[PDB]
Write a protein that binds this ligand. Structure first.
Ligand SMILES: Cc1ccccc1CO[C@@H]1C[C@@]2(C(C)C)CC[C@]1(C)O2
Ligand SMILES: Cc1ccccc1CO[C@@H]1C[C@@]2(C(C)C)CC[C@]1(C)O2
Lengths: 258, 258
């Protein structure tokens, strides 16, 4: 992949691999989320930000990292094994709040848009996990890599007891940790989907997922995935620590019949 | 990737992705095993065998599939994020016993061999799971895609109670299933490694893994990963069904200090 001509977005092509697809012989939404992260990491390296943490100079001095606050993905068509998908990504300033990253997915052959995503990322001190606002010094470091006029690819309630569906006692394995020994964010998408009934997964495709991230999760921890139907099929989701512990994630999904 | 000039082996290049690497910023052995499977699947498609099951014409008529009996991987150097690895693969007849698939991994830049693998695959009826010998009709269908003179890339005891180390209650999630809703074989490598102490993983790299596959495993099942030190560091491994149930896998690993 590469930066585009104007230097303000990044494109990469991926050939869908055999082990990346599910029963319908199309890429899983976890594969799609991994590809979104990969093209984002390559974009960060292409402008001089990357060691596992994409950071600006002032972020590194202040022990700040970007953490996901919200992820929103819409997929029109999942690509097949051997298909070529092209993903374009870019970022925009959200003032003091944080930083937006957007993506557009295309079928490389037809040029049709097959998916879109947007995310909100916020500053966090990597040691204390306390959220911070974006200073002028940090914003000024990355603004020169962003379109400055709008370019858009486009509350979640708390699940009430009792949950309709659950998958409890979910534990990460080493494959779920990133190069910084943090639980990979895509893991959270997988954990949400684990509590969706097999009958729904067999008969429907995921069209939209929205996840809020409240509090990151850890290697030694145990997570419960809770789901209730709110309806297409529509669900409300809550990830919380084992033992009726703290909320990690809440989300919604929208599913279309096959 | 593509078949080579003579049509008897297949090469593919992979650019190591951010999410494919572990703490040492090099590809995990699970990433390497996924890449071995991918280049093998692309080789099978390139000669007309592939629907999730690579099968010959007579295999499809008889409801036979190839299943892994043994996997043996040696890694000299794990590639970094952004590195290009080229994998060459080929197969050879093992007479009536089964079919061998071999791989060689190179660093595309230096041309140095960075790893090697060999595997034994056997015929199994997909419905009954009973092992079968390779008939002349099946062997004759695939022999024309194999070197016929030797081309080589190059017993495990049963772990005794009590195990030195364990990870119990391991359950697959949907991401661990392949396009045929079988547990992906690479999952078995991940499950073996889960019972290796974190201190060993932090201070050592995996140099050799050998796995025997006894009995495939299922979606609804629970697996215990058992490990004892036999020594570099050397381990003996046993995967068995929960409740002191049937053996799934046995294996060995050899680890080098970082
Ligand atoms: C802000 C920015 C502009 C242009 C190129 C790269 C960046 C850095 O983006 C960060 C890198 C990251 C990506 C790895 C998903 C994680 C947070 C972030 C917004 O997306
Ligand atoms: C036997 C053969 C010769 C040339 C090209 C392909 C094949 C089929 O190989 C099979 C495909 C497979 C691969 C997907 C790992 C699984 C079993 C097998 C030996 O490796």
């Amino acid at each position: 992949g590469s930066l585009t001509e104007d230097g303000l977005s990044y494109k990469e092509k991926f050939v869908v691999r055999s082990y990346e697809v599910g029963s319908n012989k199309t890429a899983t939404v976890e594969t799609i989320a991994n590809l979104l992260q990969e093209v984002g990491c390559n974009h960060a390296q292409s402008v001089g930000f990357s060691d596992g943490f994409a950071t600006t100079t002032t972020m590194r001095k202040l022990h700040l990292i970007w953490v996901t606050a919200r992820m929103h993905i819409e997929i029109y068509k999942y690509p097949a094994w051997g298909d070529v998908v092209e993903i374009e990504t870019w970022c925009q300033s959200e003032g003091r709040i944080g930083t937006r990253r957007d993506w557009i997915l295309k079928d490389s052959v037809t040029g049709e848009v097959t998916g879109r995503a947007t995310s909100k990322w916020v500053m966090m001190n990597q040691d204390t996990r306390r959220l911070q606002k974006v200073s002028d010094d940090v914003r000024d470091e990355y603004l020169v890599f962003c379109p400055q006029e709008p370019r858009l690819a486009f509350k979640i309630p708390k699940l009430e007891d009792p949950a309709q569906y659950s998958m409890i006692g979910l534990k990460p394995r080493r494959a779920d940790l990133d190069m910084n020994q943090h639980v990979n964010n895509v893991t959270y998408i997988g954990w949400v989907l684990e509590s969706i009934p097999q009958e729904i997964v067999d008969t429907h495709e995921l069209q939209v997922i929205t996840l809020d991230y409240r509090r990151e999760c850890q290697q030694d921890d145990v997570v419960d995935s809770l789901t209730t139907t709110t309806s297409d099929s529509q669900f409300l989701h809550l990830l919380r620590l084992s033992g009726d512990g703290q909320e990690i994630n809440r989300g919604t999904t929208l599913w279309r019949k096959k």
